[PDB]
Chain A
Amino acid sequence: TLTEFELKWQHWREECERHLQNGTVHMEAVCRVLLGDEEVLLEKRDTTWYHFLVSRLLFKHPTVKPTELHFYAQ
């Protein structure tokens, strides 16, 4: 149930990346996000520090480890 989700997620991210490559500003940025791109997640950090954290995790690290959450938050 977990590994299966992971592989589907990987496939979707591959598809999004391919679409981005083919296209190469707003949907550009949105699919920048759907992959978890650190810059575009930074340039519109305008809500809070924890909001930033949550967005970052959701996109960059869909699987979250409770033990390393402290480092991520710092």
Chain B
Amino acid sequence: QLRNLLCVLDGDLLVWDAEECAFHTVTLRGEQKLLCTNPPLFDVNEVLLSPTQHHVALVGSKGVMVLEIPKRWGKKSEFEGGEKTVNCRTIPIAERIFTSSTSLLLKQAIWYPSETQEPHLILLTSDNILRLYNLQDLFTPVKVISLSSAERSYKASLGETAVACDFGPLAVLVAYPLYILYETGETYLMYIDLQKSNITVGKLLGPLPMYPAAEDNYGYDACALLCLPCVPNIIVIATESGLLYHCVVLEGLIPSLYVFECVELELACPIKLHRDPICPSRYHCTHVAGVHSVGLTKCLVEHILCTSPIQGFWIISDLFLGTSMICITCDFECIVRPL
């Protein structure tokens, strides 16, 4: 399966090893092993670095665990002063929910985009429920949001499942717009503001008017959503077939999705979308067959890597290292390309 088992922190590459239940660290600018004190009881599919850079979420279809990143000290700024093996505190999130419900799957996890606040983790599950967790209280979600029409979720019982979600930039209602994609291609919007102790969550409002209206429902194959941090917001909707819809979010008052372009990836297949931190007009698509780069100029699609599924993908943007993509295949082939 396609996975994302790597991240980069301060110019160290962290690679998750599922057998050892540990991260291997390599200082790109020096090998240390960050061992989980409590190993994950589930297969890790994704590794998410927190915005605060102090935590790493280990994400699997049956559970989530947060690793506390050890403190750096000494002459080289190494973890715990340069020990070869560092024992990292690990904390399971929502463990009771996944252990009690054999049919419940995690669809996606995302960090709340605030750097100044305690890192909040949002879990999207196959029952169409968004659960917001604070790292202080990991047993009880701070907020539970059901994605049913306000008139298991009734929609999840009809087979309509929410598949992906992503945050747009801070907008004046100031709150973060959260876009939520269903398997049907239906996109919803919700505003989330986190003020220190009170979580103000807006009503779910996803009546985006497709421009142009679909002749045949955007297939029951919608698999990923990416918000590009621009004004107006540009949403990229990806399908398992390889179609990418570039939607401009305009005011209708429920906002409307205007499809500016539709781009087919010549894949010969669930897609993961990755923002480019340097080029806001560019993003990357990782899938079982390779990496595509998509540039919004028709859009420029470059097949960068044709594979052996991608096991990890990251874009390094460092002053000293330059801009480079790192790709790891399932056979542990590390492919580095300057961007």
Interfacial residues, chain A to chain B (CB-CB below 8 A): 1-4, 7
Contacts and interface: CB of A to CB of B under 8 A. Distances in A.
B102 A2 contact: yes
B250 to A, nearest CB: 38
A7 B1 contact: yes
Interface of B: 1, 43, 61-62, 102-103, 105
Contacts of A2: 102-103, 105
A1 B62 contact: yes
A4 B61 contact: yes
B1 A1 contact: no
Given A3-B105, A4-B43, 9 more contacts: A1-B62, A1-B102, A2-B102, A2-B103, A2-B105, A3-B61, A4-B61, A4-B62, A7-B1
B220 to A, nearest CB: 16
A4 B103 CA distance: 12
Contacts of A3: 61, 105
A5 B62 CA distance: 12
A67 to B, nearest CB: 10
Contacts of A7: 1
A73 B102 CA distance: 27
A64 B1 CA distance: 22
Contacts of B105: 2-3
Contacts of A1: 62, 102
Nearest to A3: B61
8 contacts: A1-B62, A2-B102, A2-B103, A3-B61, A3-B105, A4-B43, A4-B61, A7-B1
A3 B43 CA distance: 11
A3 B1 CA distance: 11
Nearest to B62: A1
Contacts of A4: 43, 61-62
A43 B62 CA distance: 41
A43 B103 CA distance: 36
A62 to B, nearest CB: 16
B211 to A, nearest CB: 35
Q: 7 closest pairs, A vs B, by CB? A: A1-B102, A3-B61, A1-B62, A4-B43, A2-B103, A3-B105, A4-B62
Nearest to A7: B1
A4 B102 CA distance: 12
A3 B61 CA distance: 8
A52 B1 CA distance: 33
Chain B CB within 10 A, most for which of A1, A4, A7: A1
Nearest to A4: B43
Contacts of B43: 4
B221 to A, nearest CB: 18
A32 to B, nearest CB: 28
A53 to B, nearest CB: 24
A26 to B, nearest CB: 36
Contacts of B102: 1-2
A7 B60 CA distance: 14
Contacts of B1: 7
Contacts of B61: 3-4
A2 B1 CA distance: 15
Nearest to B42: A4
A4 B62 CA distance: 9
A43 B317 CA distance: 63
